[PDB]
Symmetry: D2
């Protein structure tokens, strides 16, 4: 600590930033006014890149309009690359995820870290002497209100992409299972009550179809993010950011990201409570209620062994109950229900954040950021988890399943056309009286013959 | 009274009542709220439309006797015509079993209405039987979800309109105050200036994009069903029936009905609902936001950031004028609160799926409609008695941009 | 439509009010001002009897204080005494449950009502000529800033009193069922995976006891409400209500309601709502959270006849298909499931309100109020419907239940001392590879005579 | 790194655990089995230490009754104390915070770590050198059902304590500003309109009146955590841990922790879901609310200079504005709002989980756990954050705050008992007409004297 540093000045005096540290003062200061969590701007989905990309785009746009020097500019776009590549300058954003000011402190860190990389690429000493001053260069023709969210938009939108991959990955794990159990008679349960014969295979594609729609909805609600904002202005009208610049900027932005992003709804209201995040997250919450229930079924479908819907079998990952062999805890789905619940609850946050909008700026965006990011993150692993650890090892107990179908009283329906509806009923009450089955009542009443009898019952 | 037959014995239902035994029994079993299906945002009208659509189908498919099939759609038209024989839906909004009680009720009300329009005595007289004929090739698992999706689709058309009107109020002021300077504020700190007029246009635009979202999502309801599934696949509707029946449901509701993705999960929880309630929540977030500012902008006289004089609706400190309590933008927060809270209810509900069916459709129902109602009303209550009567305060609005501490931003050169 | 009306006037000019109508000027205006939904101040859980009591109480302390005339004080309360009872003259409180103005709307509604009702009894013609001024004589030494929350608190409390009673009738029902089924054996099961043998009498005792701690949690948080504020806040310590009054009023308010009312510790908050609300509604949400569990169980235990768990039979009361008795819907628990999610959903509606605090007053108290009452009310009924239409007549299925234990793979945990743990560890394993019961594998191998086996197992 | 190992065995198989790893196959297994977040059981509020504190009390009772041999018992509790000697052997708990098994994975994690420190001290090798056994000894007359819950509360009871210290360290800064802002007048707003005069001093004290109540609730609410269930049930009563061990070990826990650990007022369903949780996190939800409210007021009462409120001024933290100065962003009050929002969000997560209870056991405790902790952590650091880089050096622009109180026509009120209501009205009218203050109006409109007028306005 204290050892080998660099003294850097600003509006608020001179402080000695940690030498080698690519983050400058503004950042250094953030690292002290914000101490809530241990989670700092460190990514798995994106954001840091989301920022450096928003810069490159802004950079290569500035050089075009010659708003800034081509000498400094190509250093800035290049600088980006030293962070995009293998992020040969990554995790230089030590600011707590929790931070105030709608994210000035984040655009400020991105600027700084990038400012030095360029400078050092230009062979200069970073820090004290900035021949590539971040402000009038790295962040020229922009402001947090526009540069901050567009970074968050690229990010989330790219995080979502990763989420769908995972979702798809988990779907084949449902499909392979369907193709596996395609012909094992299970009887459904509406309101828990039995219903009408079905195959477990059909139970399992239902899941993959269920997530297929989650994907449909996700990638759809995610396009609200594409309408990025770069080159707007704090309040009304616009500073000189507005010009043929703004569009040229994102035109480069889309040239980097590779996302069909376009100039936002327009240049008014914008940042003021923009809840396209209420929607994109609102999507992540849907996956929650869904995946959860998907995990809710498995846990109960694989309920009590030797005493419960013993239809399937989740992989024993924990320790056997040797002397009390009665167990195989539905562990993997449970943890997923947890993430779901968490996911679900993160909604309630972001909403409050959006509701939090006050006048010409809604600062609570960063809370929407880590909240948003959190869900995409956990869901993904919650998906790979169930996938790799759970669904791939489930296997039905054909016997008790098929036997669920042949012991119901609903199967008398399939006899009705042959023994007359009225006997079917008398066959069904008896079955619901003697404790027997439609296969025995029929056989003790002398209604059919086994050959005949056992020439039907196998679904449709 | 008249005495109808039902498996759980013969219950007797008051003769003038067009519903039937199930409906009757379902009024005793479920007794939570005071509110039965008190549909303001269409619902029942949606339910009847579904039966009327199933009838047209059933006929043009030879499922039931042409006369009965016609007796049906006929009864359906007496209900829709001007929302007539309505009232026969006395089931609590809080009920059970896929809202079976709502499907059955509609079946039976249409029965006695279709009956009389044949000279048959009401109720029990079953030449035109409800289940066999009105509910033919239909089940709770499928009719019910659909009347809900369509009902909701229409309340949302009415919603956006209402919203579009509020929009009007803003883009009215927007052009009104337009000529009025004002000092913008980000983080409540003083940013660069803008015209008080521009402030309101953003409110419109906000709502402009709100609409763009509410419809955008509402169209997902169009993926419906009629004659679908209890389990995986689903019983024998899968003939001309369903698509033909949705084709029917289309031309009737006027809405572009479409047969859903595939027969496997639908009534078994629908993310479409969470999503549409979602759409309704975001609108509640921004509308709430818009009103907050409206209260912040019309704060304490002289000593309290005053830029727009909001309407006055109650008392004035006699001894000395000193208030104009933002009573209306306030009530808009209150609603948005009730709407957002419902997004939890719809969440719990739309997550409690039991294997092959969600039994909580009704609660998502009472939550959806309820939230659509107050919101729809909200937009108006703000419109008529609030924004339509908002007057600026120029000298003050401009005053802030003139005594602007950092005026030099442009005065650099 | 406009069939004969009396003329009244507020600071905002004149208006015409239905003569009959006791809800004067303000309220008439108020009715129009907000067109959110039908439900007006139609509080069955007693919001009016609250406001009326707050006024009856406060008035008495103004007579004892001698602020207003005895004769008009006697009428504020003489009138109050009326409105109360089964809930007499109290009908003229007609403003939409969603209403800005922080409750002035309602505070005035009551102010007026009691004046006119009091004037009718004063022989006076009521109306315009107010001999009990809704403000200068009723609304004396007060303000919404304290009257509204007081009534609210005072109201919610009594409403909660009803809730617990209801909840206990449900507790009594689960009880008698714990007494009935007590001798039925069932295999308890953690994480859905089988755990160990217990009586289906105990599971119901878990229910009553759950609720038992749930009621205690309700009436716990409840009494917090009793800490009120009558005539004071609008900024801090309060306006010129001091001396006897404020503490004396809350005191007399205790002589009315029948509640151990205490003035708040300080008096610099409340205006900006109180966490008591989130707290009490917390108990309501918790209650809802627990009732859900019970019903999800109730449903789970009745799950599918002959193809579900099939332990308890929820009494049938709806449908009926003869040919296929492979059914019987858990409809009543389902409904309670539904009243929960809503009450749970109201925890946000209240929350978001409490948070909406601005400077020295939270202007969203009424959306907390209604949400409050909705929760506290629907829940209560949610109890009786379950009790009366479901649990009060559940039957179990012994042979099935008991057959879940007698056949569970690990019941040899008590034969081990007799067959030697080592031997047991292989029986309970020979069972899994066969499906056979413990007895069978035991009996086949012959490690224990049917007698020295049938003469041991229950507990 | 993966540089060395040792092979342990369980019911499933043999997986070689690290030579430095005091955990066994289980933790290693439970490390792989679940992998959702990048937050394993780091544990900054307490958890681990509370967990070792339970395993320790357990032994202090097993030693006694002798369910295990005095020696090993001492090796166990010796293992405990090494962990607790300042929070030494803490890093040995790598399983995630998101985890199924309902705590089987945390339960064993502890069981092993203490098992290893135990025999190791005894002079035995780390690894399956079981002369102490996690299960057979450390977890004697214990199970996930009672160890994980009871412990979890403990680790949270102690944590919330560190919170009341935060919220109090905060209360101190607040009233610090109260005692300072004494003679600082202003206008208390209700519904954002200028209501009545006061001193900004009380304002900050109001904030504290606010926080102190939170603390009280939290003090009350934490109490619930004390009802522990160590050495209890299995399904619907009690396996064989029940005897004297049951309320003895609780006495031992009470001792080894100091907290008045009392046993369940009964014994069942508590493990199947205790509502004390929904009530505690709810108290934290309330805290985040009223606090966040205050934060929001701070951002308001300081708003934009000469174009916003500007009553009090906040500390400059961010490198200011260069070209066009006119800002002092509430960068911190901002963050406090953000955390508050998460707490509130962590409340629905706790509810949903609290709803996810199934029959004889709730398995969503872990998430209620990771949700409880996240909240107690950021709330504590918020109070200190707020208190340290903001509300410790706030200022007041006395003149404008007095500009406001002396501004609004409201002030007429007190000159009213002197000049007469009638004269008090013209004054109110004139100012309304003109745009002058009650001073100049009562001035030119000859009524009072300079002295008289300045002889009263400070309150
Ligand atoms: O990372 C970009 C993409 O690369 C492709 O090769 C993979 O198939 C995708 O899973 C991945 O999302
Ligand atoms: O009188 C018996 C009780 O039965 C319940 O069903 C009613 O709802 C209560 O109001 C009544 O007190």
């Amino acid at each position: 600590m204290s050892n080998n540093i660099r003294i850097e000045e600003d509006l608020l005096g001179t402080r000695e930033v940690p030498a080698d540290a690519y983050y400058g003062v503004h950042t250094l200061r953030a690292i002290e006014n914000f101490y809530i969590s241990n989670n700092k701007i460190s990514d798995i989905p994106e954001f840091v890149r989301g920022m450096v990309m928003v810069k490159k785009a802004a950079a290569m746009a500035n050089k075009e309009l010659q708003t800034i020097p081509k000498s400094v500019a190509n250093a800035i776009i290049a600088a980006c690359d030293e962070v995009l590549n293998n992020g040969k300058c990554m995790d230089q954003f030590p600011v707590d995820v929790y931070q105030g000011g709608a994210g000035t402190s984040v655009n400020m860190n991105t600027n700084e870290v990038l400012a030095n990389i360029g400078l050092e690429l230009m062979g200069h000493q970073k820090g004290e002497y900035q021949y590539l001053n971040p402000n009038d260069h790295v962040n020229k023709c922009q402001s947090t209100n526009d540069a901050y969210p567009t970074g968050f938009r690229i990010a989330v939108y790219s995080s979502l992409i990763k989420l769908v991959d995972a979702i798809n990955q988990l779907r084949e794990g449902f499909e392979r299972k369907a193709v596996e159990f395609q012909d094992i008679l299970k009887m459904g349960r509406t309101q828990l009550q039995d219903a009408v014969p079905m195959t477990l295979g059909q139970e399992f594609r239902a899941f993959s179809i269920l997530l297929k729609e989650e994907v449909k909805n996700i990638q759809r609600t995610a396009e609200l993010l594409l309408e990025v904002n770069l080159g707007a202005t704090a309040i009304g009208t616009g500073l000189n950011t507005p010009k043929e610049y703004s569009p040229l900027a994102v035109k480069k932005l889309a040239e980097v990201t590779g996302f069909p992003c376009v100039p936002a709804e327009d240049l008014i209201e914008a940042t003021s409570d923009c809840g396209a995040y209420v929607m994109v997250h609102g999507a992540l919450k849907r996956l929650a209620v869904k995946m959860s229930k998907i995990c809710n079924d498995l846990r109960l479908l694989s309920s009590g062994p030797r005493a419960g819907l013993n239809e399937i079998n989740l992989p024993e990952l924990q320790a056997g109950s040797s002397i009390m062999p009665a167990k195989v805890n539905p562990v993997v789905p449970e943890v997923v229900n947890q993430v779901c619940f968490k996911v679900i609850g993160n909604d309630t946050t972001v909403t409050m954040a959006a509701e939090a909008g006050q006048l010409q700026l809604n600062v609570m965006e960063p809370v929407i950021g880590q909240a948003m990011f959190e869900s995409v993150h956990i869901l993904t692993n919650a998906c790979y988890n169930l996938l790799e650890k759970c669904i791939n090892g489930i296997t039905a107990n054909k016997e008790v399943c098929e036997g669920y179908v042949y012991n119901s009283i609903g199967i008398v329906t399939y006899l009705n056309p042959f023994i007359g509806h009225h006997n079917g009923d008398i066959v069904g009450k008896i079955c619901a009286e003697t404790g027997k089955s439609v296969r025995e009542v029929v056989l003790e009443r002398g209604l059919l013959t086994e050959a005949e009898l056992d020439d039907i019952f196998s679904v449709q």
